[PDB]
Amino acid sequence: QTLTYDDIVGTGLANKCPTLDDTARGAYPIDSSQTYRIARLCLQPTTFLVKEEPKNKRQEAEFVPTKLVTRETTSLDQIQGELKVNSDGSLTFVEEDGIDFQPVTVQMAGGERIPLLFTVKN
Amino acid sequence: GLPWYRVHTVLINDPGRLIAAHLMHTALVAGWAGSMALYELATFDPSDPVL
Ligand code: CLA
Numbered sequence A: 001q002t003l004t005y006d007d008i009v010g011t012g013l014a015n016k017c018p019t020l021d022d023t024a025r026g027a028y029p030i031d032s033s034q035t036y037r038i039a040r041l042c043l044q045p046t047t048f049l050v051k052e053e054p055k056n057k058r059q060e061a062e063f064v065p066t067k068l069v070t071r072e073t074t075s076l077d078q079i080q081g082e083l084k085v086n087s088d089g090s091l092t093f094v095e096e097d098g099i100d101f102q103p104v105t106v107q108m109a110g111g112e113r114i115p116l117l118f119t120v121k122n
Numbered sequence B: 001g002l003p004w005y006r007v008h009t010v011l012i013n014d015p016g017r018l019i020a021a022h023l024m025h026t027a028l029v030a031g032w033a034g035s036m037a038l039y040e041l042a043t044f045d046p047s048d049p050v051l
């Protein structure tokens, strides 16, 4: 529906991307003689995985799950850009602008904090 | 007076204070156990149970 800021404020929903009904399994036709654009792109991380340091003997590193400590400050949104139609037929999104980075700190077992710039700049 | 090596014989006919001594020894042993683990936790490397 049409919610208002006062509906959302303080709930954690401002950090959530919008969603589509289970019944949206259509298709968007792409008119090669047309020019297109992403008017809003929203990314909402749900899990952060960090590769562990396989000791000298190694064998193989794993991607270990981590705990987020910086709260509902993680999503990328309001990202815009043009959707080009290439001539092989493919589509290419070229980010122009948006809120396209969030600093995030997750914590590994043992207590090591791992900051990162979660991002899709360019 | 009592020699140093017999001070604790004053408990031999004092069951309450004998219980009090036994409690204090039990307190000290459990405190040790607690302090020893905390030291081991503060010094233990868990990153390689192989080598
Ligand atoms: C489980 C331990 C324990 C318990 C329950 C008792 C219980 C008792 N003692 Mg015994 N005693 C002990 C250990 C113990 N003692 C030790 C180790 C010694 C050798 C010093 C003695 C020497 C002793 C004497 C000489 C007398 C008693 C007496 C008594 C009675 C009254 C309390 C008193 O004055 O003692 C007080 C005893 C102490 C304050 C000893 C404390 C020792 C400290 C806490 C060790 C800490 C060292 C240091 C801080 C360690 C830290 C690390 C370091 C690297 C810095 C009571 C039955 C008295 C009594 O009625 O008998 C007639 C008495 O006159 N005790």
Ligand code: CLA
Binding pocket: B004, B005, B006, B007, B008, B009
């Ligand atoms: C459950 C164990 C236990 C218990 C409750 C007792 C209790 C007693 N013993 Mg026995 N005894 C034991 C084990 C035990 N003993 C063992 C294993 C030995 C062999 C070493 C002896 C040898 C022994 C002798 C030769 C004598 C006693 C005496 C006594 C009485 C007076 C002790 C006193 O005032 O200490 C006073 C002690 C001090 C003020 C300081 C001692 C400090 C020591 C040397 C170093 C401290 C070590 C440190 C605290 C770490 C503890 C050791 C570790 C095991 C935890 C008391 C009834 C005396 C007695 O019969 O009088 C009638 C006596 O003459 N005991």
Ligand code: CLA
Binding pocket: B015, B018, B019, B022, B023, B026
């Ligand atoms: C049904 C009665 C009953 C029960 C359950 C016990 C149980 C116990 N007695 Mg024995 N005792 C009894 C009757 C009983 N006794 C009688 C009739 C006498 C003659 C008066 C004695 C004389 C006696 C002596 C002289 C000593 C004991 C000690 C102990 C304790 C040794 C183990 C210990 O400290 O664990 C370690 C403790 C824990 C893990 C925590 C225990 C917490 C429990 C559940 C008690 C909670 C509080 C409770 C309301 C207080 C009453 C305790 C109860 C013993 C009456 C143990 C709890 C020894 C003792 O006190 O050692 C310190 C000791 O020195 N008892």
Ligand code: CLA
Binding pocket: B008, B025, B028, B029, B032
């Ligand atoms: C089954 C295990 C067990 C048993 C049977 C005992 C038995 C005893 N402990 Mg306890 N203790 C234990 C585990 C045990 N403990 C644990 C796990 C801890 C935690 C680390 C302690 C900590 C502890 C403290 C802090 C104290 C005792 C004390 C005592 C004695 C009290 C009765 C007394 O007057 O002794 C009469 C004393 C003796 C017979 C002396 C026996 C000497 C023993 C065998 C050790 C040998 C000498 C020693 C190693 C030299 C010390 C060198 C070092 C200081 C550099 C008794 C001998 C108290 C004590 O000794 O009071 C004087 C005391 O202060 N114990």
Ligand SMILES: CCCCCCCCCCCCCCCC(=O)OC[C@H](COP(=O)(O)OC[C@@H](O)CO)OC(=O)CCCCCCCCCCCCCCC
Binding pocket: B002, B003, B004, B005
């Ligand atoms: C938290 C832990 C804290 C632990 C507390 C520290 C330990 C506590 C005290 C222990 C010290 C014991 C000293 C008692 C010493 C002392 O009091 O002795 C003299 C003492 C005499 O006792 P009596 O029966 O005459 O009683 C008189 C009373 O006033 C004693 O309280 O005999 C005993 O104690 C029996 C054991 C004799 C041990 C004699 C050893 C001889 C050493 C000399 C040889 C040296 C080497 C030279 C050859 C190379």
Ligand SMILES: CC1=C(/C=C/C(C)=C/C=C/C(C)=C/C=C/C=C(C)/C=C/C=C(C)/C=C/C2=C(C)CCCC2(C)C)C(C)(C)CCC1
Binding pocket: B028, B029, B030, B031, B032, B035
């Ligand atoms: C009060 C209280 C509390 C607290 C508690 C605590 C804080 C405790 C502590 C305790 C502890 C913390 C303990 C400790 C202990 C220790 C000890 C007891 C030890 C001893 C040792 C020894 C005995 C040794 C010996 C030796 C040497 C030194 C050398 C080598 C050889 C030998 C081994 C012989 C609470 C809050 C809960 C509650 C309320 C009340």
